[PDB]
Design a protein around this ligand. Sequence first.
Ligand SMILES: [Cl-]
Length: 196
Amino acid sequence: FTFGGVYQECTELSGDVLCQNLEQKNLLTGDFSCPPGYSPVHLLSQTHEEGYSRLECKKKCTLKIFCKTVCEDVFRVAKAEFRAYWCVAAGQVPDNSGLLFGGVFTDKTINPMTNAQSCPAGYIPLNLFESLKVCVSLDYELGFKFSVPFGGFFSCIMGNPLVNAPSLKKCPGGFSQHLAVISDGCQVSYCVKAGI
Ligand SMILES: [Cl-]
């Protein structure tokens, strides 16, 4: 099975502080898209809210004619929508280009491939959802050492098209199902080869 990457779009809803950390381009395309011959699979769309301190200035006046400005940190709420995708081969189309898969982890979970909140050596962490990191690499000769076969993603709203169109929330063939994250009550899982 070939892995065409993941990506994540973002739209600011109040403030403009969040999409910097929420948006994630696809390594393979330079954009929020899938390589030719791959299909975007929409895993999830949700809004992230966050409290932050914004610097603001305000004028206090005595009799509207003697005025002074003061600037302070003020507590505000930032909100933004993220829309999460992964890329799956619709057909065999042109090969062998695709990404090596090196596990996933969050700020509060651990990556079974490396047993650390990290990716294997030479791998890039890509942002997905609010805090998931997806470990990815492009160099087969150094990556395959640290790569596990990848069997797809699926979520509470979207099945896994690699199962063998019907989109079943399942893992294909000889792959085992593992929980990635629960994002605002929505389950997101991934599939890897049977193993510890
Ligand atoms: Cl949802």
